[PDB]
Structure 1
Amino acid sequence: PKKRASNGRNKKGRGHVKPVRCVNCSKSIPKDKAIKRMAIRNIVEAAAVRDLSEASVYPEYALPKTYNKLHYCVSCAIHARIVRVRSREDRKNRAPP
C-alpha cells in the first residue's frame, strides 16, 4: 500500500526536479527528496580554542566558522542515523527535534 501522502518527497505541482548527489555515496537523488542538513561548525573544534587564542597575534580575533550543506540519500541517512525509522503515527511529525 501507500506509505506516505507525500510519496517520500516534496513535489506537489511540479513533475520534475533537478537531482543532486549524496555526499556519502554519490547516489543521484532528486533535490526535494534529499535529506539536507546544515553543518555550521567552529573552525577550531572547541578543544583547541584556548591554544589558538594564546597563540594568536591579534587580540579579540573573531575566530570564523565553516559552513557546509550536506545532501543525503535515504540509504545513507538511515545508515548514518541522521534520520531513523519512526513509528507509523510518529512518521507524520514534521517538526525538527
Structure 2
Amino acid sequence: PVKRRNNGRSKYNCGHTNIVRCQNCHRCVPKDKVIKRFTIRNIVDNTIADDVLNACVIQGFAIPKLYNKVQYCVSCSIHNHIVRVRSREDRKIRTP
C-alpha cells in the first residue's frame, strides 16, 4: 500500500527537479528528496580556542567560523543516525 502522502519527497507543481550528489557515497539524488542540514562551527575546536586567543598578537580578534551545508541520501542518513525510523503515528510529526 501507500506509506506516505508525500511519497517520500517534497514535489509540488512540477515534473522534474535538479539532482544532487550525496556527500558520503556520491549517489545521485533528487534535490527535493535529499536530507539537508546547515551547520555553523568554529575553525578551531573550542578546547584550544582560549589557547589560540592567548597566542594571538592582534587585539580584539574573533575566531572565524565555517558555514557549510550537508546533504545526505536516505540510506546514509539512517546508517549515521541522522534520521530515525519512527512509529506509524509519529511519522506525521514535523517539528524538530
TM-score, normalised relative to structure 1: 0.95
| Superposed CA offset, 1:20-56 (max 9, x none) | 0001100111001000011211111110111101110
AA aligned to 1:65 is: K
Runs of 4+ in 1 over 2 A off after TM superposition: none
User: What does 1:20-39 correspond to in 2, within 5 Å?
Assistant: 20-39=20-39
User: Structure 1, unaligned stretches of length 5 or more?
Assistant: none
1:12-91 matched pairs, under 5 angstroms: 12-91=12-91
**What is the TM-score with the length of structure 2 in the denominator?**
0.96
SS of residue in 2 equivalent to 1:71? strand
User: Considering only aligned residues, what root-mean-square deviation do their CA atoms show, in Å?
Assistant: 0.8
Structure number with higher strand proportion: 2
Number of paired residues? 96
Partner in structure 2 of residue 7 of structure 1 = 7
Query: Sequence identity of aligned pairs in percent?
Result: 57
CA distance in 2, matches of 1:90, 1:81: 17
